[PDB]
Each structure stands twice: as C-alpha cells, then as structure tokens.
Design an enzyme around this catalytic site. Structure first.
Site, PDB file in Angstrom:
ATOM      1  N   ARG A 158       0.787  -1.133  -0.053  1.00  0.00           N
ATOM      2  CA  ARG A 158      -0.079  -0.172  -0.077  1.00  0.00           C
ATOM      3  C   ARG A 158       0.821   1.366   0.087  1.00  0.00           C
ATOM      4  NH1 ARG A 158      -3.259  -0.415   5.204  1.00  0.00           N
ATOM      5  NH2 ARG A 158      -4.516   1.461   4.537  1.00  0.00           N
ATOM      6  N   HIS A 189      -0.398   7.400   6.942  1.00  0.00           N
ATOM      7  CA  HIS A 189      -1.294   7.671   8.353  1.00  0.00           C
ATOM      8  C   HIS A 189      -0.446   8.416   9.347  1.00  0.00           C
ATOM      9  CE1 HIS A 189      -3.000   4.132   6.392  1.00  0.00           C
ATOM     10  NE2 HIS A 189      -4.097   4.396   6.958  1.00  0.00           N
ATOM     11  N   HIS A 201      -4.920  -2.446  13.594  1.00  0.00           N
ATOM     12  CA  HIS A 201      -6.470  -2.860  13.599  1.00  0.00           C
ATOM     13  C   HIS A 201      -6.353  -4.058  14.690  1.00  0.00           C
ATOM     14  CE1 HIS A 201      -6.027  -1.422   9.396  1.00  0.00           C
ATOM     15  NE2 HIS A 201      -7.101  -1.361   9.582  1.00  0.00           N
ATOM     16  N   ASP A 273      -7.964   7.888  12.582  1.00  0.00           N
ATOM     17  CA  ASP A 273      -8.059   6.350  11.981  1.00  0.00           C
ATOM     18  C   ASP A 273      -9.408   6.108  12.658  1.00  0.00           C
ATOM     19  OD1 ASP A 273      -8.008   4.432  10.285  1.00  0.00           O
ATOM     20  OD2 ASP A 273      -5.945   3.773  10.826  1.00  0.00           O
TER      21      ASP A 273
END
Lengths: 525, 521
Positions: A158, A189, A201, A273
């Site tokens: 990514r 981020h 996460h 986030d």
C-alpha cells in the site's frame, strides 16, 4: 449552498464532526459487517440528525452510485462521502478501474522516476474522476507511509516506496492528479505507519525512533503533501514515545496539535483513523476517546464505536468545561471549507465518468504492471503438458477475500490450456495437503492489508513441497518481500512476480510463462 | 415508444436476425467478461443489435449493473429486444442485489406436507421474480423448470426441479407461472419433453431418454401440458435423444418432436426455443451451420446462443436459396416473436421494483427455508470451545462458483464465535487433506447444476474422516440425495440439511447448532 455555521444547533455542530460507516450495498440484509455497518433506519436517522459524513465499503460501482444518491437525498447539509480507494475506485467498487498497488509505481520510480510520476498523476486523476462519478467526494489516499520495515503486515505494498524521496514524489504526484477534480485528498497515516511489524487494527504499535529520524524518514512525504495542499491528514493509532509517552497520536495534543497543526502548519481536516480499531479501543473507552481526540485537535471522528453516546459525551464535556463550545465550531469552520470545495463540482453521473474499456486507462494499468514485474533471470520456461496431466495450485491468504479469483480468470484459464488443472487452497491449509506428485505450478496471491497479524511466509512449505513433488515454477502476486528468500532457498526453481492480483495482472504473467501456443473451456455458466 | 412495424416490412436478413438470441455479460465493460469466448464485446453487441438481432441473454453483474446494461442494449435496437436470463431461483440467483429465492425443490418439499401453502409460496416466487426482472429491464424469464427429477443421480437438474412426481411439478410450476403473469414478462417451460430421468448433463454430452410414448405422457409431459394450458409464453427444448419419438434426431433438431409432439399434438402456440446451441450435447451431434438450419426445419422459433452468429445468418440465407428452407418459414417465426414482444411492449425502474428488505419478501424466503429443512429427528446442540480451538471445515463443489461465501458470512462467523476456526476446501481436495484431530464441524455446500458430470458424493470421505478425528456434526446445503447414505453410514454423527446455500440459510442452520468479529474491512 451551505447554511451559515452559526445557524447550526450545538448538537448539529457536533454531529458534523462525525463520519459513520455504511455498506455500498442498498439493503440491510446484504451488509457483510452488520456489527459495524449502520442499517438503513439508523443511517437515515443519523443523517437527518446532521451527521457530517459517511464512509462506504462494498458494492459494485453501480450500486454505490445509487447509494450515495439516497444518502444525500436525506441530508439537509451535503455529506462528505469517503472510501478507502487507494488502488483506484475499482479496488473498492467493482466496475470501476482498479490500479496496481502504489508500490508498483515505486518500483518504476527506481529506474524511471519521470515516467513513474506521470503514471501516479494519471492514477490520482482517474481515481478522482471515477469517485465523483459515484458520488464519492472524499478520497482517503494517498498513503504516505514509508514502508522501511519489510515485515510490515498492514502497509506493505500500500506504500509508494521504502524511502522518503520515493514516497514524497509519487504521493504528491497522485495528489496533483486528483486536484484536477473537486474531491478532498487525504494523507495517511500521520506521522506514518511505515516502520512497524504490528497492525494497528489488531494492537497498538510503538514506533521508537527519535525526533531527528522522524523528520528524516517518516515526515518528509507529509510535509510535501501539506505544502501541496492535501485537504485532510489522517493519523495512525500509534505510540510515538519521542513525542508522547502517554497517549497514542489519536489522543495526543502534542502530536495532533504540536506536530501537525502547529509545527507543520497544516490548515485542513485532521481525521482520526477508524475509532473501532483494536489499537485505539484497547487504549480507552469510547466516550473517553472521542473527547480526548477532539481535545488533541481532531476535526473528524471517524467511525466512533458509539455515535449516539459520543454526541452526548461531547455535550457533557462542554457543560463541565472539559471542552468548549467554541472549540467545536473551530472544527466546523474547517469542515465548511472542505465542503465548500466539493460543492464546486458540476454533477457527474454514473456510468459517465467511469473509464471502463477506455484504451488509455487500460494501457496505463497494463504498463504499470509490466514495468514493475520481476522474475528470476534465467531462460527457462514452464513446460506444456497433455490435458490434465499437470497441477496448477493456486494459494491465497483467504478465499473469502480473493475477489480477483473468478470463473475462468486468466491465472486459471491460461495454464489450463497448457495441461495444468486448477486447485485452489488457502496458505494455512497447504502444509497439511498431500500433493499428488505430478508437475505442479504454484501461484501465490499474498500481500499485506488491514487485519493481517503477520505477512504470509510461504518459503518453508514451498521448500517442503519441492522435495515431495516436481515443482515447475512459483508465481507471487502482491508482496515482493519473500523473493530474496525464495531465490536463496530454491534457486533451481524459476519464479515470476507481479504487484497486481487482478485479471490483467494474471494474464500478463501467465502468458509469459510458456513458449508453446495454447491448446484447445466449454463452460458458459 | 411506437407500435411494432408489420412483420412483412423486415428484410429477409432482419427476419432471420429476429430468431437469434445472443449471449452477453451483465457487466458494463469488455474487460470484465468472465467468459469472453461466449460473451460478445460491446462493439459486436451494438453491431448485431443495430443489424436487428432479436434478443440478448445475460449472465453475471449486480442488479444495478444489469439495469444500466439493458438500458444500453435497448437504446441500440430499432425493434425492442427480448432480454432473457436464467432466473430460476429468483432474480437474485443471477444478479446480486435482487431477491434470491431457495431452489424449486424446497417448494416441492413443502408441498408434500402442505400443498396449499407451497402453492401460495410458489406464486409469490413467480410474482417477485417477474417484478424484479422488469425493474432491471429483463423481460424474458427462463423458468420454470418443469423437469421431473425422478432420477436421484441427475447431475444437471437435481434441486432445480420443483419435485419428483408430475402432480407436484405441475402444481408448483403452474403456480410460479400464475405469479409471473401479474407482470408483463415472458415465462418459459424447460426443458421439453423433460430432462428429469437421466444421469447425464446435456452440457457435457447427449443423453438418451429411453421411455416409451405412454410413459412420456404419464410422467414427463403432464407438467408441460399444464404450463401450456396455463398460457406459458415459451417452451425451451432439451438436447436429448428420445428414440420413441425420433430415432435419428435429438429433440432440438427433430421435426417429429418440436412440430409433431409440441406444436401440433400439445397445440402450443408460443415460442419454441432451443436450449443453448453451444452445449456439448448438441455441438457433438453436428456442425454449427447444420444445427441452426435443422433446428429451424424442426420448428424452432428462437435459436439460443449459436456458436457462430454471423455464420448462422449466412447459413440460413444459403439454405433458403437452395430450397431446403422457405423464406415464409422465417416470417412464420417472426410472427410468433411479434406476439411475444407485443405482450411485453414497454424504462427500467431500478431500484424501484426490487424487494430489498421488504418484510413480506424476506419472510417468504426465510419461511421456505425453514419449512423445507431436514434434521436428525432428535434435538441436538454441539459443544462450544475457546477461540480457534476447534475446526469449521467448509467444503464446496468449486470455490469459484460459491458466491454465497463472502467475508463474515454466517456459516463462517457463527461457528467462529463458538471456537471453530474456518477452513475452506473444495471437495476434490478434501481426500488429500490430513486433518488435525480436534473437534470438527463439517459444512458441505453441494448441489446439481449446469456443467456437473456427476453429483458430488462426500460419503466415503466423510466416513474416513469420522474414523480419524472427533467429528461434532455435518451440515449439507443443496442436494438432499445423499442424506439416506449419510444416516446409514454415520448413524452416530449429528446432521442438518437445508436446500438453500445463501447467507440467510446459513444463519438459520448454524444458529440452531447452539441456540437449540473485530474485522470491519
């Protein structure tokens, strides 16, 4: 036209700061994640109560076009509509254009920076165009993380690259492309998620580098994107002990205000986030998180676990003096500037604005895949065999999450014409599978992504299999990080690599495997 | 929107074109076609349509995509197109976002103990299918399947049939038609004179039905007669050798069958449609040019999916020049096509017309599933375990053809909450998987469909597994035909069965295993 800020009730003002998660699908019974995705009644209720925006996941492009129309029709104040479209709109919503992942652009940048930059602008431009076509006005991209830890499970491909120069040039190129259209762009981020092996996460990562190093590596792409006029900056949930030993970035005044708003002089939307992420929810209770995020300087609370409680908890904080009413209206002012920019667009409407079969777009995708491909340097090719003599073993992270595998996709159809019959398994199953010993081609689709505890490591099982059966070749689609070990452990076995997992990526690699022309599927349904 | 022009005003080539229905994908773009060998690109479709092709049959795409597709296809047509799909199990079977119903045999299962109710439910199924089809711009429903599945080994029909006896199929088949007749869409009886008694899939090879005339009129035919008397608009023929009627020619190519048995004896006045002409059963019989000409000579009005469309048109023109076909024969078919197109004559309303979350529709689906379900006859709950202690082994026919497995779908999510970590494998892989001995639940999604050589038969492997590891239970979704063998072979293993494979069907069953997730992306 937007109403004056002052015309908002305090509760509508607070609601403006909140963005909630829906599904792109039209109907409740279709939500894949009903625990996180608001049903229709709740979505209409929130929107009618003045929620600021919606983030969407799932659905075809055509469905989404229908969804965003329905949502906006409920809104008195136009909604921000966001999606995590990092690899083209088509990454999220099928029927729009999927680009290869950002790191493919980075691979090209190594030998041909000017071309890579051009391609990245085209990616931004097309993403932005197709977004508006679907009613998505908020692009959450580019990822500016610098993936300098090859074990990073969450960022991985990514990222546009492994160095700040690389990432800065490509990320800003993407932003310049998207700036041809009226959509918000988002740097993620902050202050970069690049060097860690931990997925936020799952758990709260700590990046232990000092201030000098943060300004040398992590920061430069953000500074560039800020100077380039990025509209929003999304923070990571991360401990950055050089700056704050107490709070993760999401809750940290030092980080959100001290570093981002103050030092870097960022004037746009500061966005958390997702607040349902393990990294944050393990740190503090939901009501504590929203109040502290605001106090730290966040403008947008993204996906609070409890939206109705958040609003009340914020009202409460104001009544006790913990938060000020004027602080809320500072974020609303910023949100107004952003919404003013997206009102500017002339309507575009699906299918119009979607690239589809457009040759220029399809060629861009093909070119990126081709220039970023890698393969063992040897002349050897995979052998053709009589029908159903050989085995084409397809290995994925998860079958549920492999949309690129479809009936008669090229990774299947092409080897089939060379004598290789398809078998699909998940990597975790492979070690326990007893493979018949017949010539076998193995194609691994493996990559990093949200909700990955660790990157898949195929090498051990590949080595074990090579000793059991006649392994003809190995293909990797996605992450490049195990190629070195593959080449070192099994140099006798040819390998090919592509960053893309999509049909066109499969077609390019698979077509290059064979010298012979294809032989002879009858299936239509 | 104007009236249809007189039939006589079409050129011969335009008349021939009207008889042809070509395949396309519901997806908007060429690069998305799953089957580019069988699905025409947009350029070709526009050419064919502008030249007068009679209709398009669509596969794949979300309901929302299909609604754009049909709008685009009709915009190119001077004469309105027939737009067909095989929406047997609800529109949602084909195009996601519309309502997917359980398969017809579930309705037959209900009819056994409650015929009045089964019929009401089958009518609702037809009505909803027709309503949703129209909202997508699909005007031709190819359904109901009227085949009588009296050979339990039939790989192609299987649960697509409303039942195993003609009374049962006639009742449910006509009810579906009555439901569909509330809307203006064509309905289609399939596959004449019924594909039920065979173990061979006509997609892979030419089956022979060896029954005499008396038996054909006793078993296979009665549901077709009832559909015809009930005003079904089209009858699709099977590619089948029926040696009692015709010894040289399969039904598709046979004058005695299509004209003699169907058009004349049964007095069927509507569209006589070939089954897809790219099917192995027919393509193995004769060359493409021979097939289209002989199908017309046999009495076919509609040539479905000719392997070569341009070649077929030439071949038919050539056959008229040579006197093997007469020009007026073509116009006789165009005339019938005009009757059909007149019935459906008028802009697709999607999402209006789609049921979505409508409670009545959702309750109909859940109720059909619940009532058609089968269980061990005792009440059984299975143990729970701490996270990832146990194993939930999901076994499918083909991973590529299992749209019902989606992230966090109930068959995965529910057992996961009880300590069963999911593992997904294809049945053909399973015998080679060496399982860890830890508590294990097995869920098999297995059924007949097109392109099935033989029904999946898990019994032997399940037996080997049950001896190796601590099997907590087995669940079957799909075909009911291996349940007797399961109970006889593994009498000590608890089992559950549902006809439906979709999310709601998974939820019902899995929830019952006990009561009786951090990932967002």
């Amino acid at each position: 036209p937007l109403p004056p800020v002052e015309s908002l009730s305090l509760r509508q003002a607070i609601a403006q700061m909140i963005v909630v998660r829906g599904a792109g699908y039209l109907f409740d019974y279709e939500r894949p994640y009903p625990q996180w995705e608001a049903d229709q009644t709740t979505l209409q209720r929130w929107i009618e109560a003045g929620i600021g925006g919606v983030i969407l996941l799932g659905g075809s492009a055509a469905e989404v076009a229908q969804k965003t129309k329905q949502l906006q029709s409920w809104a008195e104040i136009p909604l921000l509509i966001a999606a995590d479209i990092e690899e083209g709109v088509g990454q999220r919503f099928r029927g729009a254009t999927e680009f290869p992942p950002p790191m493919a652009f980075g691979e090209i940048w190594r030998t041909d920076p000017h071309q890579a930059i051009a391609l990245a602008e085209t990616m931004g431009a097309t993403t932005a165009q197709e977004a508006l076509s679907l009613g998505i006005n908020w692009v959450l991209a580019p990822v500016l993380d610098v993936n300098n830890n090859p074990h990073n499970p969450v960022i991985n491909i990514r990222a546009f690259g492994e160095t700040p120069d690389q990432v800065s040039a490509l990320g800003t190129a993407f932003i310049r492309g998207a700036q041809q259209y009226a959509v918000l762009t988002t740097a993620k981020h902050f202050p970069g998620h690049g060097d860690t092996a931990t997925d936020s996460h799952l758990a709260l990562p700590t990046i232990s580098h000092d201030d000098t190093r943060l300004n040398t590596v992590e920061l430069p792409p953000f500074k560039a994107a800020i100077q380039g006029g990025v509209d929003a900056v999304m923070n990571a949930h991360l401990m950055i002990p050089a700056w704050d030993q107490q709070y993760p970035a999401t809750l940290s005044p030092a980080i959100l205000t001290g570093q981002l708003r103050h030092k870097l002089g960022f004037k746009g939307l500061i966005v958390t986030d997702a607040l349902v992420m393990g990294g944050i929810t393990q740190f503090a209770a939901p009501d504590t998180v929203v109040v502290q995020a605001i106090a730290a300087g966040a403008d947008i609370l993204l996906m609070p676990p409890d939206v109705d409680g958040a609003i009340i908890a914020i009202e409460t904080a104001i009544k006790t003096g913990q938060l000020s009413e004027s602080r809320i209206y500072e974020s609303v002012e910023r949100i107004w500037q952003a919404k003013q920019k997206i009102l500017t667009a002339t309507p575009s409407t699906f299918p119009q604005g979607i690239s589809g079969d457009r040759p220029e777009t399809r060629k861009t995708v093909a070119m990126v895949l081709e220039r970023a491909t890698k393969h063992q340097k040897s002349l050897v090719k995979i052998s053709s065999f009589p029908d159903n003599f050989a085995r084409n073993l397809i290995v994925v992270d998860s079958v549920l999450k492999s949309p690129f595998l479809r009936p008669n996709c090229p990774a299947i159809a092409i080897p089939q014409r060379h004598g290789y019959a398809a078998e699909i398994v998940e990597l975790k199953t492979l070690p326990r599978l007893q493979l018949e010993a017949i010539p076998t081609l193995i194609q691994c689709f493996l990559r990093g992504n949200p909700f990955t505890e660790k990157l898949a490591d195929p090498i051990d099982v590949l080595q074990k299999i090579a000793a059991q059966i006649p392994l003809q070749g190995v293909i990797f689609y996605g992450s490049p990080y195990f190629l070195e070990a593959l080449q070192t452990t099994l140099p006798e076995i040819p390998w090919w690599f592509s960053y893309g997992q999509m049909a066109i990526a499969q077609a390019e690699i698979c077509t290059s495997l064979w010298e012979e022309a294809p032989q002879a599927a009858a299936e239509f349904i």
